[PDB]
Amino acid sequence: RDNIQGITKPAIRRLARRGGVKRISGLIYEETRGVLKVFLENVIRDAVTYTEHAKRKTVTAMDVVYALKRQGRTLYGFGG
Amino acid sequence: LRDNIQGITKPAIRRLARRGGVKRISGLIYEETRGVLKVFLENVIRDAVTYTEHAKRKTVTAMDVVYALKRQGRTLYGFGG
Amino acid sequence: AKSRSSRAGLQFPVGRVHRLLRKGNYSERVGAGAPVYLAAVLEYLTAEILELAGNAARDNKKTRIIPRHLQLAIRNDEELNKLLGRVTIAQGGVLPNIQAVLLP
Amino acid sequence: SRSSRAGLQFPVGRVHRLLRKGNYSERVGAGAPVYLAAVLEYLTAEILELAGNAARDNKKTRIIPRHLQLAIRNDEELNKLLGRVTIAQGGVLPNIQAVLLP
Amino acid sequence: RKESYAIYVYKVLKQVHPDTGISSKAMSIMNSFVNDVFERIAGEASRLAHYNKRSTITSREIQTAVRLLLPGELAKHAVSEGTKAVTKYTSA
Amino acid sequence: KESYAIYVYKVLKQVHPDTGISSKAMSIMNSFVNDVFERIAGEASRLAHYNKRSTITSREIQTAVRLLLPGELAKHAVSEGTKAVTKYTSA
Amino acid sequence: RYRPGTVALREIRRYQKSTELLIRKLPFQRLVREIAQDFKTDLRFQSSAVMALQEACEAYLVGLFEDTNLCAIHAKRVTIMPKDIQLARRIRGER
Amino acid sequence: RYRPGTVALREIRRYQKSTELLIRKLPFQRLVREIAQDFKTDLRFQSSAVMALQEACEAYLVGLFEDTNLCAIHAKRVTIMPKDIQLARRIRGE
Amino acid sequence: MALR
Amino acid sequence: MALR
DNA sequence: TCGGATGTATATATCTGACACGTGCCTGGAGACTAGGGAGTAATCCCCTTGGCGGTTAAAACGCGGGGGACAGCGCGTACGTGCGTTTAAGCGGTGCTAGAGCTGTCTACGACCAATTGAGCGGCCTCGGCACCGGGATTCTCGA
DNA sequence: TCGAGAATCCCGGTGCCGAGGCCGCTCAATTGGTCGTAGACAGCTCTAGCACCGCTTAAACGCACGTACGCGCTGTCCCCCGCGTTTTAACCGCCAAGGGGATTACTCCCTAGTCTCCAGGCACGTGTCAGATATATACATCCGA
């Protein structure tokens, strides 16, 4: 539903600035959208799989934490 | 046992770079390669020797080396496990 | 039939897999369909790998499979290479790739 | 209590029960809970000492995720320990490349 | 008496590539691969059962772990094969 | 539900008598304790399995600690564990 | 007017010190729901679940941008580019 | 007399087609024993253990050189320099 | 069995 | 409590 | 624009170490029966998610002018490939030896299991204190001469 | 080096939202005993890891050359950057509904355990075979002329 456009250009600029980046190319936003979309699918597939195994319908923060742990991206602060 | 890093000769590093598909090599690549290989070897050997020490042994085994490699995320097939 | 593998129509050892699941401290109890499912998965993965290994062997005009063939088969397939992306096959070598700029 | 006997702050009994119920092995020795609890308490004390130092340098008394992340990333050995770990609401270490600096 | 997947791997090779052989070092690599896949699947299944406060590992846990661990098409075919094997075993 | 929050607070008052801690920080530290406990238990479990042994003991824990921890962290955690075990048996 | 290269440095310094979330919450929530649609239908989400997703995503993007900046500095540039992003990701081992 | 780089491409072909070990066995073994001297004196080694060590080290170095080559190409160059190796190690996280 |  |  | 010298793929021999098949038999897999409890199913409640509304106002979108950095081209010097003659030690095949890995016997010290306590630890609740924000001044930067 | 113009830190008012401390209950940790077996320990075996030697010879080394290619520099130009204006929708309460998570209780069928026999699978034994060099020959393939 063209919701990936909601990750707007100034937000990607802010992320880059936090990453220490001084100059940005025009195509960086369109490439960053693809990268982020891929990462989100990779995590959400596992989270939804955990939810389906539990026989639930609400994806839980515990499901998201497990999905992140399975990919070597351990997250702290959400009941990890 | 001393000065044994030089057994990793310049032509051997050139051959490894060729298998890695490198066409041209700077002269100062060999010392850097020796350092990197030393660090990797020290990590792996320390873990394997820890395993042998825990097993009450004086012999380092292929199984201990394989467990060390798997621990570092460098799983190795062919020597059992 | 007699063997649990014959009933499931498999080749991998269902009873051996059940014993390993029980002895591995994975869980306190183990269901009776779990070893069947796991042996079927293992057999399917072995067949997937061995088919491509034999394909590479036949390409190289060979009748015997070697670690080089296993490496070629694994690294050429997009999904097997992803499953085994942090594995080092002993005596495997690397895929024959050359970057375009290096070529004359 | 086994924690007071061992001379610690962490629950040796709870750690023992977790070791026995985590399906790690068929049997648990009596000294293993003491060892694991001592290690856990020591690591917690390290993190909190460093984070309290960062909080004091920040002119604050309450440790917050930013202080924890600052302590962890400033400490090289602890950075190695918690390598692939995200700390929520932690931020990053302030650094800029010298080439980017004017 | 050291057990291994040698005879089963050779039987699969006979059923898939009849007139082909296999070297012993390639056989060792195959054995290691099987042990590794078993360990990964069983570890994920155990972790899942612990998450769900279960005590027994079932074919449900095995199937879910297979989904989590394998890339898409591999996951489809492996799930198909596992379901087929359990169904035939239960029918027998 | 149970958590390490109270013991973490006790350690925090031992090391910094005048310092609070927010709930997000406490949740992060509770997660950290859980993660490190899981890692060390898993390594000792793998060790005991490699050695055809059915018991997790202080030796397995010490070896796991040495495998997981870098340099000074391992060298000091080992001393803390040894002291705790020695005192516990002596009392 | 402020010459180019000064406001960017000021923004870098500001955003490397604050710790808040840098992506708008309603757009991120909509994007997460739309992505999850392909795996299941009539799916609910916990607030903490969406928040954890945002935290992981933003941290991943910040790390990726840092490595992209290293690639740009290596190539004797100041401007990060898609070739920099792609090189960093492929060396990291994701593409 | 071949032009430079022709033998380089021939060697890339040869060593990317082959699979044998490219380091010398006795020097590598002496290096391994010397390194292990620092952890526990008077230690024995299985031949299988030393072979596994060597296979791991060769594979690791080959992959690292692949990444270094990519970095050098990214810098509009064809010669690999220690900066390429350092950058590859940083990005990989080592 | 049934391969891809 | 032996810290670094 | 033709000729050449080096490497590589092709034909065939061989003697091999390696492997594909047959077998003793013993240990592990299968049968038969039960004992209990893990999990399924049903039912209830109330948390917490989802959907809608009205406003405000900060962030986003957009255009504009320019200057700064990306990029293409060019010239230079140096450093790396290439090839050849000389120096070295890896590799191979033996030969000897004893350390240490592995397996059998034993038997005791330690951890599992159970019944019964009693207290440490988990929720509810208050009350009040330090930091988020704002009003105002001063230091640290940049931008222009 | 020397002017002004902003951005932001520090000082003080302050208020307020949730953390630190305080109770009631309760289940889980502790304490005692009993008991089976895991593993420390002791001893005999036999493999294999280490050590010494002698010979090839293949790889490592040093050196001389020259050619491609890092590298600096100069100029063009286009493409981000900073900035002011209009436009969008996020955020913030706040309400309304109810789906589904979370809990308790009753069944009952699925798995652990145990005693048996009984062959599948390992170690052993053994005879044949695909091929790595070895020798010789034809086909590309750029490099000097």
Author numbering:
A (entry chain F): 23 to 102
B (entry chain B): 22 to 102
C (entry chain G): 14 to 117
D (entry chain C): 16 to 117
E (entry chain H): 30 to 121
F (entry chain D): 31 to 121
G (entry chain E): 40 to 134
H (entry chain A): 40 to 133
Q: What is the paper's account of this structure, in its own sentences?
A:
The proper control of mitosis depends on the ubiquitin-mediated degradation of the right mitotic regulator at the right time. This is effected by the Anaphase Promoting Complex/Cyclosome (APC/C) ubiquitin ligase that is regulated by the Spindle Assembly Checkpoint (SAC). The SAC prevents the APC/C from recognising Cyclin B1, the essential anaphase and cytokinesis inhibitor, until all chromosomes are attached to the spindle. Moreover, we have identified the molecular mechanism promoting this localised interaction: we found that a loop on APC3 and the N-terminus of Cyclin B1 both contain distinct nucleosome-binding motifs that regulate chromatin localisation. We conclude that nucleosomes facilitate the interaction between Cyclin B1 and the APC/C to promote the rapid degradation of Cyclin B1 during metaphase and safeguard genomic stability.
The sequence of the first seven amino acids of Cyclin B1 are conserved and resembles an arginine anchor motif. To gain further insight into the mode of binding of Cyclin B1 to the nucleosome, we employed cryo-EM to determine the structure of NCP bound to a peptide containing the first 21 residues of Cyclin B1 (NCPCbNT). We obtained a reconstruction at 2.5 Å resolution showing residues 2–4 of Cyclin B1 interacting with the nucleosome acidic patch on the NCP. Cyclin B1 Arginine 4 establishes hydrogen bonding with the acidic patch residues Aspartic acid 90 and Glutamic acid 92 in H2A, and the peptide backbone of Cyclin B1 Alanine 2 interacts with H2B Glutamic acid 110. We obtained similar results using an N-terminal peptide containing the first 23 amino acids of Cyclin B1. We tested whether this interaction was mediated by the putative arginine anchor in the amino terminus of Cyclin B1 by mutating the arginine residues and observed a significant decrease in the binding affinity in charge-substitution mutants (Cyclin B14E7E, Figs. 4C and EV3E), or when the first nine amino acids of Cyclin B1 were deleted (Cyclin B1Δ9), or when amino acids 3 to 7 were mutated to alanine (Cyclin B13A5, Fig. EV3G,H). Ectopic Cyclin B1WT-mScarlet largely overlapped with endogenous Cyclin B1-mEmerald, whereas a Cyclin B14E7E-mScarlet mutant failed to localise to the chromosomes. To determine whether the N-terminus of Cyclin B1 was sufficient to localise a protein to the chromosomes, we tagged Securin with residues 1 to 9 of Cyclin B1. Securin-mScarlet, was enriched at the mitotic spindle but largely excluded from chromatin, but the Cyclin B1-Securin fusion protein (Cyclin B1(1-9)-Securin-mScarlet) partially localised to chromosomes. We conclude that the N-terminus of Cyclin B1 acts as an arginine anchor to dock Cyclin B1 to the acidic patch of nucleosomes during mitosis. We conclude that the binding between the N-terminus of Cyclin B1 and the nucleosome acidic patch confers timely degradation on Cyclin B1.
